[PDB]
Structures are given as structure tokens and as C-alpha cells.
Design a binder for these strands. Structure first.
Ligand SMILES: OC[C@H]1O[C@@H](O)[C@H](O)[C@@H](O)[C@@H]1O
Ligand SMILES: OC[C@H]1O[C@@H](O)[C@H](O)[C@@H](O)[C@@H]1O
Lengths: 207, 207
DNA sequence: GCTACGATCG
DNA sequence: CGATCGGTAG
DNA sequence: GCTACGATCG
DNA sequence: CGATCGGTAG
């Protein structure tokens, strides 16, 4: 059904105006691939790792993380993460601060302090903001990324994203890099598929 | 001695490169006027009020604040502020959130929870960041503004300031609005007078 | 060969 | 405040 | 006549 | 997440 969702999203975006129709046509079908099968602790750690880093840099770090902490080159279990000292994690490429935060997330998972996937699925984005922000290292941007790339939510507009703001400036022909609320206002017509709208804006550099 | 300080600062900035020399020449003498005579609670409230607002908008609000809470059109005392309900403060132009934060600051002053001016004068900017950030509504930007406009510190670079970032993009000929650390790096040569350098960049729009 | 591009800590 | 992890495009 | 331009809260 | 106080330049 993700296919039907993307088709509906693409049709909606193409109905907004000339610029959206043109962008969707040039970029082609949305190929965004979320991974809801991932447990919350994994999705959260993947989101934290991506903070301030490009996809390529993030992937290189996660790859080393899996090779170091896992036995079957898979994503490390909470236990395996706790059995790895922060210095070893840092050696994988995580900043020292992220190394500490990842340890805390693993421990929270082991102690059942993180909401279950079942609970998270019933929570609105606003409720997720209130709940997950209680985790050290996890705030607005990280929760938006977890919502898009792990949960697969379709109407998330990461208006605070620097890259998206730069792309919105070009796309909307603005005289200056927009503030967060300005991006929120400009992309309102994209509802209820703002995640897909964000994805299309993120593809502009590739063009 | 503030005059000798500004003269020294202007001479230093003019010794960096062509662009700084030219900017200082075009803008003229630095006319920044700090107000260290203001008590910490006043400087902090003035800084909070200025959050996200232009100087003109900020002044209009403070003007109403003084007329409403003071008896002699002067800046309200901590007691006078506490005697004013948050709804009345909101009517002066303060956002509802700022109204609550200003009440908290006034109460902190009455309860001697804010460091004394004497202590603040002995604290480094880093120490002020650690100390004053414990106040609701007061974080990095606000502390930088308090340091510049109230304390009169000369080497404060508010690298996180949106306006300054926009001006730095133009001044340094950057292809994109710079990130905070980029502004920090680009203005390093301005030490030990980065407050004055920031002031000159803030004058670019006037030109 | 060289630069720039989340959220937390004293 | 002023740093932080890194692949890669300009 | 009309738009845009810190830090906190459920 | 998605708002928030307002004078004023474009
Ligand atoms: O990390 C998630 C996303 O963050 C954005 O800032 C980057 O521009 C995207 O390419 C990346 O997929
Ligand atoms: O509020 C203090 C300063 O904040 C900056 O963002 C504005 O551009 C300055 O004009 C103002 O004086």
C-alpha cells in the first residue's frame, strides 16, 4: 500500500501549482524507503547518528558500528551496545557525545524506559515530540527523522532542516533562507503528504 | 575609556583586510552604547524582550511596560513586576510565554537567585552561559545580547544570530548562509574586539 | 589538495 | 561560548 | 495594503 | 510539531 500512498501523494503535489508539478515530473517517482520493522531504539540511534552528517558519512559510521558490536554484521542489540565502552564506540566514528547518548538509549531500551513500538504507533507527532524529547540527544529534528525514515509517516514537514530550508529558498524563489515557520506556511498546501513534499525538495541538488 | 576602546577596535579591524577596512570607513565610528548601570534582572528582561523582535518593536513594548508597571516612567522594580499579573504584561506586547518568564526573572531577583552584578563581572562568557542558562527563557543568544548591550563586553561574537549570519554571507561573499561555527571561524581575526566587528556587520543594511 | 555542510557540555 | 563525528561536492 | 523577520509548551 | 509578541522595510 506504500505504492498507492506515493501515487496519491504525487498526484496531489502535481495539483498544487506549476512549480510542484514540474518538480515531481523532473525527479520522477518517490523512492523513499522507510524501515518500520526497526525497533524504536534502533531507529532512534540511526536518527541520532545522522545529526549534522550526510547520508554517506552516517552510513560509514553505522557500518563500522555493526561490524564492531554485532556478531553477524547486523544492527547491535541493546545488550551488545552496553557491552561496548564509549571509547570503542567513538572509534567507529560517533562523536564522544553521541557515543554517550547511544549508550543511554541502549540502557533505556533494556530498562523499558522507551515507549514500545505499539505505543509509538498510536501517538501523534506532537505526542512523540513531548515523549521522545525526554531522551538525551533526541530533540525536534531527530524525532522528525525517526518519524520519516523509521515510522514511515507521510505528513512530516521537517521545517527546521537546514538543507530543506536552502532548497525551499530556491524552489519558492525567496530572497533569503526562510525561517522554520515560513517553511511551515509555504508547504501547507502539500498536506496530507508533506513527508513526500520534503523528499522532493531534498532531491533538488541531484537535479 | 570606552572611546579609547572603540578607537583601538576600529584601528584593529582596519588592519585585517580590504573588506574590513572599507566597511569601517563607510560606516564610520562605532556608536554602540551599552548600559552596565542596569541591574542584572533589568538587562536580562531587556534581552528576553528582544528575542525574535526588531529594536523598534522591542522598544515599543518596553515603553508600554514602563508606563504600566512603573510610577515614574522608569524601568519596573522586581516588586512592581510581581505585582502585575501576566495578562497585564501580555497587554504591553510581551508574548504570553515571555510574560511568564519575566515574572520568573523578577521573582528570582527578589529571592537573590540571580548572580549579583559583582559576581557576573568576574565571570567569563562561558561561565555566564552555564549560570544564566538555568533561567527559563534565557539561553545562548539572550546571554550574548545581555553581555553586549548591558555588560559592555568587547569580544562577543553572536555567531548564532540570524541577522549577523545573513550579513556575514554578503560580507564574506559566501554561497550560502553560514552555520554558527563558520561565522566563528571567519571572524576570528577580529579578536579581541569581536563585539565591535559584530556591530559593524549589523550596520550593513543601513548602507 | 582544501573547505563547509543536531544537540550537548563546563 | 566554541567545539564536536565524516563522506563528498564545489 | 501585505508579507517576513529566541526559546518554550503540551 | 506549530504556534508565539510587533515595527517596518521591500
Ligand atoms: O539525515 C536525514 C536527512 O537530513 C537532511 O539534512 C539531509 O539533507 C538529507 O539528505 C538526509 O537524508
Ligand atoms: O536585539 C539585539 C540585536 O539582535 C539582532 O538580531 C538584530 O539584527 C539587531 O539589530 C539587534 O540590535
Amino acid at each position: 500500500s506504500k505504492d498507492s500512498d506515493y501515487k496519491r501523494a504525487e498526484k496531489h503535489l502535481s495539483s498544487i501549482d506549476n512549480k510542484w508539478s514540474s518538480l515531481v515530473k523532473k525527479v520522477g517517482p518517490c523512492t523513499l524507503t522507510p524501515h518500520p520493522e526497526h525497533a524504536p531504539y534502533e531507529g532512534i540511534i540511526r536518527a541520532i547518528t545522522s545529526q549534522k552528517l550526510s547520508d554517506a558519512a552516517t552510513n560509514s559510521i553505522i557500518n563500522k558500528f555493526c561490524t564492531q558490536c554485532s556478531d553477524n554484521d547486523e544492527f547491535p542489540t541493546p545488550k551488545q551496545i552496553m557491552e561496548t565502552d564509549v571509547e570503542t564506540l567513538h572509534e567507529c566514528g560517533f562523536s564522544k557525545l553521541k557515543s554517550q547518548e547511544i549508550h543511554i538509549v541502549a540502557e533505556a531500551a533494556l530498562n523499558k524506559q522507551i515507549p514500545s513500538k505499539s505505543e509509538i504507533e498510536k501517538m501523534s507527532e506532537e505526542e512523540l515530540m513531548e515523549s521522545l524529547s525526554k531522551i538525551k540527544g533526541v530533540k525536534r529534528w531527530t524525532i522528525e527523522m525517526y518519524s520519516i525514515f523509521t515510522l514511515g509517516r507521510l505528513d512530516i514537514m521537517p521545517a527546521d532542516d537546514s538543507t530543506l530550508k536552502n532548497e525551499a529558498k530556491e524552489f519558492f524563489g525567496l530572497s533569503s533562507k526562510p525561517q522554520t515557520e515560513e517553511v511551515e506556511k509555504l508547504t501547507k498546501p502539500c498536506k496530507p503528504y508533506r513527508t513526500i513534499a520534503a523528499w522532493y525538495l531534498w532531491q533538488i541538488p541531484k537535479l
